[PDB]
Design a protein around this nucleic acid. Structure first.
Lengths: 23, 488, 98, 122, 475, 310
DNA sequence: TAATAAACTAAAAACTATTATTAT
DNA sequence: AATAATAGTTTTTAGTTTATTAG
C-alpha cells in the first residue's frame, strides 16, 4: 500500500518540515 | 518479529554517468554519490543494523568473488560505517571519478544474466529473517539494446522469477526527468531522485508491540489488551566510554568505601537511614522496597466516570495508547468492538487504578475512546483504540493567587482580534524538528569527515515573526492604545 | 599508634583512592615511616591484595622486591587499626610464588 | 493447510508425493489443473510456512521430479539459511529434479560448493 | 598427531578470524568436539593438550562472538571430561587454571555464558582430582571470588551462584586465609538466604542460590556452631519456614530439597538443640518428602532421617527421664506402620529401623523389653524370609535395614534366646547369595550392615568364635 | 515560585511577565540516606573507584586519561564535552519567542507533552499589560486561537515549547500551560480495524447488557437540575498513598522498631472504594455479562515464600 | 543562591533469542 | 532421548547525583 516510508514499509512516508503558516 | 531490509545499488560504467550530463551541474555519477551519502547518513541515524554492499558492473576489471566479466564489487554486506562513507566519498568529482575509474574500471558491457546470477547467489548468504528487500536503480537506458534479444528475454524470465520471489525494481529518469524517455520497454521487464537524495534527516522507527495488559475490571473478569507507548522523547546518543589515544573504554569498580577496612562497604555494612528531627531513622533498601507494595501490576478498575463531566485544567504525563487485542483470553475483541460505537454513553471515561509494574502503587487513569480516524487516504489517523490520560493526585498543585483583576474594553478586543486574525497556522505537526539534537548530529558529522561543522542552521524554531509583523502589518504597534509601555 | 615499626609504602593505584589516602594518613598518624618500595630501608612492602609477586615485578618494574621488607594484606593492618593493636602478619601475606 | 503440528502437513506431503507417481493418478493423465492449484497453495507464503513447506516439497517431489522445476532458485537461496536436516531435504529435492536443466554445476560454484561438500556427513 | 595437524590447520587461520576464518574455526571445533565422542590414545590426547595450552590463546582471549562461540563450545565439550581420566593433571591443572582465569577476564567468562560454569564444574573435578595436591590451589583463588561478590550486579542470567558451591572446601588444606573470612562469608550467605527467604512474591528467582549455599555449607561447615552460636537456631528456623508450610512450586521433584536433606545428614551436629525443636512437624514433613516419587528425594530423606535418628537416640539416652512423650510417639508411629500392611515397601523397614536404634533407651527402660522386641524382630524376619521358600521375596533391599537394626539391638542387648543362634547362620549364608543383585551404592550399604552386625555379634567369648567359624565355613 | 521574564513577538513586542510552576507532583522529601549497620553513621561511607580501563588486561586508569566516546553507527567516535561547549547548540534562554498562532480546533490532548502547568502573568508597573492581557484573552476565546511559543527558561534551559490558555471564570484568570511535542515526541504503530471484525463483533444482547452495566454504573451522577454533574470520587484530593503508607508504617519504627511495620490499613482502602450501591446495582448486569462473555486464562503469577508455618 | 534543569546513576520489562525438561 | 517450561540480550525508566538558580 502507498503512503508507507520507503526505508521502513509499514511506517508512513512523513512529509518534511514546513514551519509555521500565517493566514 | 523484527526482520531486516537488504538494499543493493547498481551503477553501469559506460561514461553515460561519468559524463557531466552536458552541464555544469552534478554528473549522474556525482548525483548518485550525493544520493549515497544521503542514504548512508539516513541509515546511520536510523537503525543501522541493515547491511549495505557496494557492487559495480559494466567494468574493465573484476573483483566479485565469482569473477564474472564486467562486475567489480567494493563493499561487502555491512552496516554503513564512517570508513565506508569515506571510501565511497573519496571517489567523486572529476578527480575522484578518474582515480576510481583507473582503480575500478572505466567502462565495459553488461551481462544481465551474470548479474542476476551473482545477486541471487549473494542474497542466498543472508543468515537472518528479512522483513523487506529492495533494489534501487539509476540508469539512463530506455530499453535493452546492446545485449541480444536472447539476453533480454532471459533477463525478463529472471526478472519475473525475482519479482515473484519478493524483490522489486525501482528506477528514475536520467536523460530528461519528466515526460517519458526511460523505460519504454523496461515498462515490460519491470522529481523522485531528489527524494533519493538528501531530503529526510533524523529518522527512526520501531516495529515492536508493548505487552499484554490484563484488565482487572472485577475479580470475575480479566481481559487482554495491548498497551502501546506512542509518544516519548528521542534521546542523546550514549557517551560510550573510550580512552585518550588507545581509544578504549573503561570498566568500573564503583563501590562505596568504609573507613574501617581497606575493603568496601559490605551489603550489610551499607545500611539505610534518614534524618527526621533528632532521629537517624534506620532502615534498609529492602524495607523501602517492601514498603511500596500495594497490589498487582495491572489496571484495577474503579469504574467508569461519565466523560461528559471532564476538565482540561489538569495535566499529567503524556497519554498511552491502549488497543483491543485477543492474546490469552477469548471474547476480548468481541466486546472490544463495543464501547467505540456510541458517543452518548460509551465515550464515558474510566476512572481506574492502574499499577504498571510489579511492586508499584495504584495510579489513577482515565479512558478516552480514540476512534480509528483512518485517514481518507487509508492512513488510519488517530488509529482505532484508546487514549489513556493519567489522573492527578492531591500533590499536583502549588497554590496560585487570583488573577481575575480586569476584563478590558471592547476597543482592545477589536484591535487585537484584528491583529491575531491575520495569522492562522494549519498546524503542521512535523514542522519543527529538534534543533538541539540536530545540532548534536551536526557536531558528530563535523567530527566524522573533516568539518569544523557541516551544517550551521536551526530547525526553524528561530522566530521568523520579525518578518511576520510587516506581513501582519506593523499596526500591532499602533494598536497599542496603552498609555504606558510595559517594557521600559 | 603502632605503624612506626612498619617502614611501609601504600600504593596509590589498585589500593582505592580513599582507601589509599586513609592508609597513608593512618601510617603517618601512627608514626609510620613512609618509604618507597624501590630500594632498601623498607620493613614492609605493602601492595595490592589481588596481585601476585610477578605482578609486583611488573608494576614495580623490577625483577625482585627490595630487601628487608615483608609482603602482607592491608586487611590485616586495617583489623589491627580498628582494634588499635597489632596482629601477626601470617594468614594475610600477599601471595609470592617466586 | 493446517500448520501447527508436524503430521498435519507431513502426511499430506508424503501422500501427494506417492500420488504424483505418474500424474495426479498413479496410472494415467488427462488434467493438470490440480498441479498449479498446488503450485499456488504452496506459494502462499513459502516463508512463514517454510520449514513445513520445506518438508512438503521434500515428500512431494521425490517421486515426481518435475515438481522441483520451480524451486531450485529458492533452495539455493535457502542453502546458507539452512544449518541442519534442511540441507538434506534440499539435497534430495535437487536429487530428484537433477535433469530439466543443462547447467547445474556453475550454480554450485557460485554457491561456492567447495565448502559445502567438505563436510563429514555420510 | 592427527589432532595436532587438524588444529595447526585450524590455528593457521586462527590469527584474527574476523568472519570467514572465524566461521571455519567455529564449525571445525564444533564438529571435532561432537565427533570425538568415543584408551591407549591418552598419551596423544595429553601431548595434544600440552600443545593445546597455547591453542587456548591462538583463538583470541577476548570477547568476540566468533571466538566466544569457540570458547563456549570447547568448554561445553570439556564438560564431557568430568571424571578423573587425567591422572597427572598437576601440570595442565595449573596450566588450565591460568587459561580459565584468563577467560574469566572475558564478559562473565564468555560473553555472558557458561564458560565460568563449565570451568567451575571442572574445578569440582580438580577438587576430586588429587585433593592432596589441592593444598595451594585454593591458597591463591579465594580473593577474586570474594572480589566479585564485593561488586555490584554480579548476577548474570547464567546461573552463577554455584560459585557459592565453590567458595567452601573440606578437601582443602584449610588455610587461615578464608578461615578468617568464614564469619563474613556466612553473614553474606545468610543475608542472601533471607533475601530469597524474604516474601519473594517479587524475588523468588534463583532458588538455585539456596541449594548452592547448601552445597557450600556441606563443603565447609567444619567450624562448630552447634550451640556456640545462637544463629544456629536462626538457620534452622529459616529452613523450617522454607519447608514446613512450603510453596506449592516444588511439586516436580527438584534436587534442591535433596541437597538440603543430605546436607542435614552430613551436618546435623551444627543444628543441636534444634533437632529436638519442632518434634512432630519434622516427622510428617520427612514422611511427605520421602513419600515423593523422586529417587534423589527418597535417598536424601533416608540419610537425613539416619542423622536425625542417631542424634535423637543420643539425646534420649542422655535424658531417659525426659522425652517420654518423644519415645512414646516414636514407638506408636512405628507400631502403627508395622501392624499396618506395607504400603510403600518402606514403612515396615523404616519402623524396624526405629525399633533397631531404639534399644539402648529401651534397655535402660527394661532389659526384658529389648529382649522382647528383638525376639519379635527375629520372628518377623523369619516369617517373611526364612519361612518363605525364597521364591518371590523382594525385601532384599531392606537387608541393610534388617542388619542395621539387629546390629544396634545386639549392641544394646545381652540376653538372647540361643534358639536364634542357628536361625542367624541360615540368614548370613543365604543373604550373601543376594549380594550381587544389590546396587553398588547399597551394596556398599550392605557391606556396612554386615560389618556392623559382625561388631554386634562380636560381643562374646565362645559364642563369638563359634559364630564366625560356622558362618565363614558355610558361606 | 515567582519567575519573571519578558515575552517577545517579533523583535518589537516585549512584555514583562512572571511565571509560576503550579502543577508539580510532590515526591519523597527526605530521600533515604545510607549509614553503617553496626554504628548507624556515615563513618564508613566513602567511595573507591577511578573507573579502571576496559581491556583484555584491565588497567586501573585515571578519570582524565579517558575519552567519552559516542556510539556512531558501528563504532565509538572519540569526543569530549569540551568540544560540545565550543560548538554545541547555543540556547538563548529566558525568552518566550512566539512563533505563530494556529486554530484551537487543531491542537489535541494527544499532542500534549510534559507533566506540569506554568501560570504566567504580567509583571508589575505594567497596568497596560494587564488590560491588554484580559482583552487579548477575550479576543483569543472569540477567535479560537492557540499560540506557538518557543520558550526557553534560562541560559541553562533548551527550547521548551508549550501553550498556556486562560481559565476564564469568576475565579482566577490563571494560565493553564501544557508542553507541546515534536515529531521525535510521537510514534504511530499499526492498529487493525475492529468494528469490522466478524469473528469479534459484539452481539446485540451482549451490547444491551453492557448498556445495562453502564446505566448501573454511576460515578459522575447527574441529579442537579442546575446542570451540575456530581462526582463521588475525585482524584485531585487523594495525594500519593506513598506518603500515608510511609507515615503509618514509620509510626512503629519511630516508636518501637522491633515488631513489623503496620500494614496499609483498611481505612486507606476505604478511601479507595466507590459507593457500594453502584457495585450492587451493577452486579446483576455484571452477572449477565459474565454469563454472556466467555473467557480463558493462563496463570504466570508469583507466590510469597515468607510464609506462616500455620 | 542553598534547588533545579538537566542530567544520571541505577533499573524492571520488553521482545526476542533461545533454552531445557518431561514428551518415545 | 518423545515436549514444556523458561531464557536473555536489547530498551525505556526514575529515583540518585550534579551544577546552577536556591534561606
Amino acid at each position: 500500500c502507498p503512503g508507507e516510508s520507503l526505508i521502513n514499509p509499514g511506517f508512513k512516508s512523513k512529509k518534511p518540515a514546513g514551519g509555521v503558516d500565517f493566514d | 518479529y523484527s526482520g531486516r531490509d537488504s538494499l543493493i545499488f547498481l551503477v553501469d560504467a559506460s561514461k553515460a554517468m561519468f559524463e557531466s550530463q552536458s552541464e555544469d551541474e552534478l554528473t549522474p555519477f556525482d548525483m548518485s554519490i550525493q544520493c549515497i551519502q544521503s542514504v548512508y547518513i539516513s541509515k546511520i541515524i536510523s537503525s543501522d543494523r541493515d547491511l549495505l554492499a557496494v557492487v559495480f558492473y559494466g567494468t574493465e576489471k573484476d573483483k566479485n568473488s565469482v569473477n564474472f566479466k564486467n562486475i567489480y564489487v567494493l563493499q561487502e554486506l555491512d552496516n554503513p560505517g564512517a570508513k565506508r562513507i569515506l571510501e565511497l566519498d573519496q571517489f567523486k568529482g572529476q578527480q575522484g571519478q578518474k582515480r576510481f575509474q583507473d582503480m575500478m574500471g572505466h567502462g565495459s558491457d553488461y551481462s544481465l544474466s551474470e548479474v542476476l546470477w551473482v545477486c541471487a547467489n549473494l542474497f542466498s548468504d543472508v543468515q537472518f529473517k528479512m522483513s523487506h528487500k529492495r533494489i534501487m536503480l539509476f540508469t539512463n537506458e530506455d530499453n535493452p539494446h546492446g545485449n541480444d534479444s536472447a539476453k533480454a528475454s532471459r533477463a525478463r524470465t529472471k526478472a519475473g522469477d525475482l519479482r515473484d520471489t519478493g524483490i522489486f525494481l525501482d528506477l528514475m529518469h536520467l536523460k530528461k526527468p519528466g515526460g517519458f524517455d526511460i523505460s519504454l520497454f523496461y515498462r515490460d521487464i519491470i522529481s523522485k531522485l531528489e527524494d533519493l537524495l538528501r531530503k529526510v534527516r533524523a529518522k527512526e522507527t520501531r516495529k515492536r508491540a508493548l505487552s499484554r495488559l490484563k484488565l482487572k475490571l472485577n475479580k470475575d473478569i480479566v481481559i487482554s489488551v495491548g498497551i502501546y507507548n506512542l509518544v516519548q522523547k528521542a534521546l542523546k546518543p550514549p557517551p560510550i566510554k573510550l580512552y585518550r589515544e588507545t581509544n578504549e573504554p573503561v570498566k568500573t569498580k564503583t563501590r562505596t568505601f568504609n573507613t574501617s577496612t581497606g575493603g568496601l562497604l559490605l551489603p550489610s555494612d551499607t545500611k539505610r537511614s534518614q534524618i527526621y528531627g533528632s532521629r537517624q531513622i534506620i532502615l534498609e533498601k529492602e524495607e523501602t522496597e517492601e514498603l511500596k507494595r500495594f497490589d498487582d501490576p495491572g489496571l484495577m478498575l474503579m469504574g467508569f466516570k461519565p466523560l461528559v463531566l471532564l476538565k482540561k485544567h489538569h495535566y499529567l504525563r503524556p497519554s498511552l495508547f491502549v488497543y483491543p487485542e485477543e492474546s490469552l483470553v477469548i471474547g476480548s475483541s468481541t466486546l472490544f468492538s463495543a464501547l467505540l460505537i456510541k458517543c452518548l454513553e460509551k465515550e464515558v471515561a474510566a476512572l481506574c487504578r492502574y499499577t504498571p509494574r510489579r511492586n508499584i502503587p495504584p495510579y489513577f487513569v482515565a479512558l478516552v475512546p480514540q476512534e480509528e480516524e483512518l485517514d481518507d487516504q487509508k492512513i488510519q489517523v488517530t488509529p482505532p483504540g484508546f487514549q489513556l490520560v493519567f489522573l492527578p493526585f492531591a500533590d499536583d498543585k502549588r497554590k496560585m493567587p487570583f488573577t481575575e483583576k480586569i476584563m478590558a474594553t471592547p476597543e482592545q478586543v477589536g484591535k487585537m482580534k484584528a491583529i491575531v486574525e491575520k495569522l492562522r497556522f494549519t498546524y503542521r505537526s512535523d514542522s519543527f524538528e529538534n534543533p538541539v539534537l540536530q545540532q548534536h548530529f551536526r557536531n558528530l558529522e563535523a567530527l566524522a569527515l573533516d568539518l569544523m561543522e557541516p551544517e550551521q542552521a536551526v530547525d526553524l524554531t528561530l522566530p521568523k515573526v520579525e518578518a511576520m509583523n510587516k506581513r501582519l502589518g506593523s499596526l500591532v504597534d499602533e494598536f497599542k492604545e496603552l498609555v504606558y509601555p510595559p517594557d521600559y | 599508634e603502632w605503624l612506626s615499626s612498619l617502614r611501609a609504602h601504600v600504593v596509590r593505584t589498585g589500593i582505592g583512592r580513599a582507601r589509599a589516602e586513609l592508609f597513608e594518613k593512618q601510617i603517618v598518624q601512627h608514626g609510620g615511616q613512609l618509604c618507597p618500595a624501590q630500594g632498601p630501608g623498607v620493613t614492609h612492602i605493602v601492595v595490592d591484595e589481588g596481585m601476585d609477586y610477578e605482578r609486583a615485578l611488573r608494576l614495580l618494574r623490577l625483577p625482585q622486591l627490595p630487601p628487608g621488607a615483608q609482603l602482607v594484606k592491608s586487611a590485616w593492618l586495617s583489623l589491627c587499626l580498628q582494634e588499635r593493636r597489632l596482629v601477626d602478619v601470617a594468614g594475610f601475606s600477599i601471595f609470592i610464588p617466586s | 493447510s493446517f500448520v501447527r503440528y508436524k503430521e498435519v502437513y507431513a502426511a499430506a506431503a508424503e501422500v501427494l508425493g506417492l500420488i504424483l507417481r505418474y500424474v495426479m493418478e498413479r496410472k494415467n493423465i488427462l488434467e493438470e489443473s490440480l498441479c498449479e492449484l498446488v503450485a499456488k497453495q504452496l506459494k502462499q507464503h513459502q516463508n512463514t510456512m517454510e520449514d513445513k513447506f520445506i518438508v512438503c516439497l521434500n515428500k512431494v517431489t521425490k517421486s515426481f521430479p518435475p515438481l522441483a522445476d520451480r524451486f531450485m532458485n529458492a533452495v539455493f537461496f535457502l542453502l546458507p539459511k539452512f544449518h541442519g536436516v534442511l540441507k538434506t531435504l534440499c539435497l534430495e529435492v535437487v536429487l530428484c529434479r537433477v535433469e530439466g536443466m543443462t547447467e547445474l554445476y556453475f550454480q554450485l560454484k557460485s554457491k561456492d560448493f567447495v565448502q559445502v561438500m567438505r563436510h563429514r556427513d555420510d | 598427531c592427527s589432532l595436532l595437524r587438524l588444529q595447526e590447520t585450524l590455528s593457521a587461520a586462527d590469527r584474527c578470524g574476523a568472519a570467514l576464518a572465524g566461521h571455519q574455526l567455529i564449525r571445525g571445533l564444533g564438529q571435532e568436539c561432537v565427533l570425538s565422542s568415543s584408551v591407549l590414545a591418552l598419551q596423544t590426547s595429553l601431548v595434544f593438550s600440552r600443545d593445546f595450552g597455547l591453542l587456548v590463546f591462538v583463538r583470541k582471549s577476548l570477547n568476540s562472538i566468533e571466538f566466544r562461540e569457540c570458547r563456549e563450545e570447547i568448554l561445553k565439550f570439556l564438560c564431557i571430561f568430568l571424571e578423573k581420566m587425567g591422572q597427572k593433571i598437576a601440570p595442565y591443572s595449573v596450566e588450565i587454571k591460568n587459561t580459565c582465569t584468563s577467560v574469566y577476564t572475558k564478559d562473565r567468562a564468555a560473553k555472558c555464558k557458561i564458560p565460568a560454569l563449565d570451568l567451575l564444574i571442572k574445578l569440582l573435578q580438580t577438587f576430586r582430582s588429587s585433593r592432596l595436591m589441592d593444598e595451594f590451589k585454593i591458597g591463591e583463588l579465594f580473593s577474586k571470588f570474594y572480589g566479585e561478590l564485593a561488586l555490584k550486579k554480579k548476577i548474570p542470567d547464567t546461573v552463577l551462584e554455584k560459585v557459592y558451591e565453590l567458595l567452601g572446601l573440606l578437601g582443602e588444606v584449610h588455610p587461615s586465609e578464608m578461615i578468617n573470612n568464614a564469619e563474613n562469608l556466612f553473614r553474606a550467605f545468610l543475608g542472601e538466604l533471607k533475601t530469597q527467604m524474604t516474601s519473594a512474591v517479587r524475588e523468588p528467582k534463583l532458588p538455585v542460590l539456596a541449594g548452592c549455599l547448601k552445597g557450600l555449607s556441606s563443603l565447609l561447615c567444619n567450624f562448630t556452631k552447634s550451640m556456640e552460636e545462637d544463629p544456629q537456631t536462626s538457620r534452622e528456623i529459616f529452613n523450617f519456614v522454607l519447608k514446613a508450610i512450603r510453596p506449592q512450586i516444588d511439586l516436580k521433584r527438584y534436587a534442591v530439597p535433596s541437597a538440603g536433606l543430605r546436607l542435614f545428614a552430613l551436618h546435623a551436629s551444627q543444628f543441636s538443640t534444634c533437632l529436638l525443636d519442632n518434634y512432630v512437624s519434622l516427622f510428617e514433613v520427612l514422611l511427605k518428602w520421602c513419600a515423593h516419587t523422586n529417587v534423589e528425594l527418597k535417598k536424601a530423606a533416608l540419610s537425613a532421617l539416619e542423622s536425625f535418628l542417631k542424634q535423637v537416640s543420643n539425646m534420649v539416652a542422655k535424658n531417659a527421664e525426659m522425652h517420654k512423650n518423644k519415645l512414646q510417639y516414636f514407638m506408636e508411629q512405628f507400631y502403627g506402620i508395622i501392624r499396618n500392611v506395607d504400603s510403600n515397601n518402606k514403612e515396615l523397614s523404616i519402623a524396624i529401623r526405629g525399633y533397631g536404634l531404639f534399644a539402648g533407651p529401651c534397655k535402660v527402660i527394661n532389659a526384658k523389653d529389648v529382649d522382647f522386641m528383638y525376639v519379635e524382630l527375629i520372628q518377623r524376619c523369619k516369617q517373611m524370609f526364612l519361612t518363605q521358600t525364597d521364591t518371590g521375596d523382594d525385601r532384599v533391599y531392606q537387608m541393610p535395614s534388617f542388619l542395621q537394626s539387629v546390629a544396634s539391638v545386639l549392641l544394646y542387648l545381652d540376653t538372647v534366646p540361643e534358639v536364634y543362634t542357628p536361625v542367624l547362620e541360615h540368614l548370613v549364608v543365604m543373604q550373601i547369595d543376594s549380594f550381587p543383585q544389590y546396587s553398588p551404592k547399597m551394596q556398599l550399604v550392605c557391606c556396612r550392615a554386615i560389618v556392623k552386625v559382625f561388631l554386634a555379634l562380636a560381643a562374646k567369648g565362645p559364642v563369638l568364635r563359634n559364630c564366625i567359624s560356622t558362618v565363614v565355613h558355610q558361606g | 515560585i515567582h519567575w519573571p521574564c519578558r515575552l517577545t513577538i517579533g523583535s518589537n513586542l516585549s512584555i514583562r511577565i512572571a511565571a509560576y510552576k503550579s502543577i508539580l507532583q510532590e515526591r519523597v522529601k527526605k530521600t533515604w540516606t545510607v549509614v553503617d549497620a553496626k554504628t548507624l553513621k556515615k563513618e564508613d561511607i566513602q567511595k573507591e573507584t577511578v573507573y579502571c580501563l576496559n581491556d583484555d588486561d584491565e588497567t586501573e586508569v585515571l578519570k582524565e586519561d579517558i575519552i567519552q566516546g559516542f556510539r556512531y553507527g558501528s563504532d565509538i567516535v572519540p569526543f569530549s564535552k569540551v568540544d560540545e561547549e565550543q560548538m554545541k547548540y547555543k540556547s538563548e534562554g529566558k525568552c518566550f519567542s512566539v512563533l505563530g498562532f494556529c486554530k484551537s480546533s487543531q491542537v489535541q490532548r494527544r499532542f500534549f507533552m510534559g507533566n506540569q502547568v506554568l501560570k504566567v502573568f504580567a509583571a508589575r508597573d505594567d497596568e497596560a499589560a494587564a488590560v491588554a492581557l484580559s482583552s487579548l484573552i477575550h479576543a483569543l476565546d472569540d477567535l479560537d486561537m492557540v499560540a506557538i511559543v518557543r520558550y526557553a527558561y534560562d541560559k541553562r534551559a533548551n527550547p521548551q515549547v508549550g501553550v498556556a490558555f486562560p481559565h476564564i471564570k469568576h475565579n482566577y484568570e490563571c494560565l493553564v500551560y501544557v508542553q507541546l511535542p515534536f515529531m521525535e515526541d510521537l510514534r504511530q504503530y499499526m492498529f487493525s480495524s475492529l468494528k469490522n471484525s466478524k469473528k469479534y463483533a459484539p452481539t446485540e444482547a451482549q451490547l444491551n447488557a453492557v448498556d445495562a452495566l453502564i446505566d448501573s454504573m454511576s460515578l459522575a451522577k447527574k441529579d442537579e437540575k442546575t446542570d451540575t454533574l456530581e462526582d463521588l470520587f475525585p482524584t485531585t484530593k487523594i495525594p500519593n498513598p506513598r506518603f500515608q503508607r510511609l507515615f503509618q508504617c514509620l509510626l512503629h519504627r519511630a516508636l518501637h522498631p522491633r515488631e513489623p511495620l503496620p500494614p496499609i490499613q483498611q481505612h486507606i482502602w476505604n478511601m479507595l472504594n466507590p459507593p457500594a450501591e453502584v457495585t450492587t446495582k451493577s452486579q446483576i448486569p455484571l452477572s449477565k455479562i459474565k454469563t454472556l462473555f466467555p473467557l480463558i486464562e493462563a496463570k504466570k503469577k508469583d507466590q510469597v515464600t515468607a510464609q506462616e508455618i500455620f
